[PDB]
């Protein structure tokens, strides 16, 4: 009676239904959970925002053209201004969170294309200057909601001003590894003849037990167009990719006044 293509996911007061889905990837075979008492790093009383922040948040819909080359989001910081998870984050020094990334892109049965949806632990990217090394600013490394785009050309700016940003090169995947090897990460491929949604379940992955979300970006969401979009009547059409992310099993420590980072 049941099928693998119809899936409803509910967290808090938010619901995603999908009728042409592929199967869901639990990353590295572990469902996210709270910090156990045998591994706890801080000793303060942890805040568990039970349903106020364990819910789906819908980002901005980027448009996937025929010349679109890729997108990237840093995952505990693309939700920095989303409801109460953006208010649980900056009022606390520590924070761990599991995730349910759901990437939404659909077309007709006459379109074609592929979207490698990745989820990269410690997605450290390269700077866009050759004056200095490991050299990216804070605003350019943490865009938040809008994310960033990749590029099919590496043009390092000789200015140290405009070179403090990610040299988001698509075939080297930012960090100088080939993109055809990126399938060792937890990944799904949106193929516009088979499916229309990619669902990943991401546990908290870090060397520490719990860490500052304001400093440290745990996961990296990556969407690569493997085969470009090609619609035969209108070759320059645009189908939107909408990313909907939920925090899961969040836990925070060290309450204080609000942290407001710089914007420039």
């Amino acid at each position: 009676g049941y099928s693998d293509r119809v899936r409803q996911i509910t967290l808090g007061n938010s619901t995603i239904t999908t009728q042409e889905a592929a199967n869901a990837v639990v990353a590295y075979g572990e469902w996210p959970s709270y910090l156990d008492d045998k591994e706890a790093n801080p000793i303060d009383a942890p805040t568990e925002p039970d349903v106020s922040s364990n819910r789906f948040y819908t980002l901005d819909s980027v448009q996937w053209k025929s010349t679109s080359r890729g997108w990237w989001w840093k995952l505990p910081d693309a939700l920095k201004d989303m409801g109460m998870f953006g208010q649980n984050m900056y009022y606390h020094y520590l924070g761990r969170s599991g995730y349910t990334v759901h990437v939404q892109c659909n077309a007709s049965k006459f379109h074609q294309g592929a979207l490698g949806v990745f989820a990269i632990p410690e997605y450290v990217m390269a700077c866009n200057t050759e004056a200095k090394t490991s050299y990216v600013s804070y605003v350019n490394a943490n865009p938040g909601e809008k994310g960033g785009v990749f590029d099919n050309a590496y043009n390092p700016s000789a200015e140290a001003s405009e070179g403090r940003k990610f040299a988001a090169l698509d075939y080297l995947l930012g960090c100088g590894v080939l993109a055809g090897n990126a399938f060792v990460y937890p990944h799904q491929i949106i193929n516009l003849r088979t499916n229309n949604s990619a669902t990943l379940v991401l546990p908290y992955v870090n060397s520490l037990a719990i860490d500052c979300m304001a400093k440290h970006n745990n996961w990296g969401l990556v969407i690569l167009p493997l085969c470009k979009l090609d619609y035969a009547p209108n070759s320059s059409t645009e189908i939107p990719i909408t990313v909907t992310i939920a925090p899961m099993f969040t836990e925070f420590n060290g309450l204080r006044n609000i942290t407001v980072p710089a914007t420039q």
Binding site: Y2, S3, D4, V6, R7, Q8, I9, T10, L11, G12, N13, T15, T17, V51
Partner: protein, 280 residues
């Protein structure tokens, strides 16, 4: 009681209750525990007032009858001395609309008669206290021609004699339908116009009004003529009790224009047009 609400939490599975298909004829079936997360709410609220015995449990008004009492000289003055009313529930628009929710109904009817008086002129003397006859005439018994003929003596017709100033007279009429339920709507005639009739019944009325004969409520003033003209008003009431109903229907939207289901041209527009579709 009404249904409570179970403590449910979020789901991620192939069991999808949020998606139905109303082509199949069934309505929606999702209760709010399905699509969201709900707490436990013990529900003590009952639906006791919405039942049909309490939805029709009011003495509505169905008509207003007028009789007078004076020294009648002309013939039009002798027809003000009494009033014969054909019994129906369609002479108002509020008990009718509550009954045209349903196609067929079965109820014992309870009536009560609230009656007022006035002097017509000012300086034409006075009058004694008055007694009012209300006679239920079944179909076939002779309807009164004058106000004091052989018909008002009521050797077998049910009559009530209300002395003016008392509590209003009340009585219960049983289910008197010749069907097994009162057809509120009847989609058919009274006869079949045959082929090549010389009768030419090309004026047979449609539908409901050719089958209902419930009687005639004839009201006189039992007194003779006082020196002062006393004009009376009588408000016949109905209250359906022991109510059963069958086969529900949508309620009346546009106003009536008769005893049928007809509707007048200048009031075929019940809605008021909103500004746009996005107006809260």
């Amino acid at each position: 009681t009404a249904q409570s609400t179970p403590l449910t939490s979020g789901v991620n599975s192939q069991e999808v209750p949020a998606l139905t298909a109303v082509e199949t004829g069934a309505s929606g079936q999702a209760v709010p525990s399905d699509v969201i997360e709900t707490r436990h709410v013990v529900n003590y609220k009952t639906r006791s007032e919405s039942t049909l015995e309490s939805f029709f449990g009011r003495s509505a008004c169905v008509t207003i009858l007028e009789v007078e009492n004076f020294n009648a000289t002309t013939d039009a003055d002798r027809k003000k001395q009494f009033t014969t009313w054909a019994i129906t529930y369609t002479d108002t628009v509020q008990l009718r609309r509550k009954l045209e929710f349903f196609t067929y109904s079965r109820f014992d009817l309870e009536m009560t008669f609230v009656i007022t008086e006035r002097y017509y002129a000012s300086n034409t003397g006075h009058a004694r206290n008055q007694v009012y006859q209300l006679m239920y005439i079944p179909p076939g018994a002779p309807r009164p021609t004058a106000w004091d003929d052989y018909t008002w003596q009521s050797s077998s017709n049910p009559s009530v004699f209300y002395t003016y100033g008392s509590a209003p007279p009340r009585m219960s009429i049983p289910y008197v339908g010749i069907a097994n339920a009162y057809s509120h709507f009847y989609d058919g005639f009274a006869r079949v116009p045959l082929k090549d009739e010389t009768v030419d019944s090309g004026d047979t009325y449609y539908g409901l009004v050719t089958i209902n004969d419930f009687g005639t409520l004839a009201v006189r003033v039992v007194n003779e003529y006082n020196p002062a003209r006393i004009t009376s008003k009588i408000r016949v009431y109905m209250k359906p009790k022991h109510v059963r109903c069958w086969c529900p229907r949508p309620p009346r939207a546009v106003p009536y224009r008769g005893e049928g289901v007809d509707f007048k041209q200048d009031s075929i527009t019940p809605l008021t047009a909103v500004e746009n579709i996005n107006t809260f």
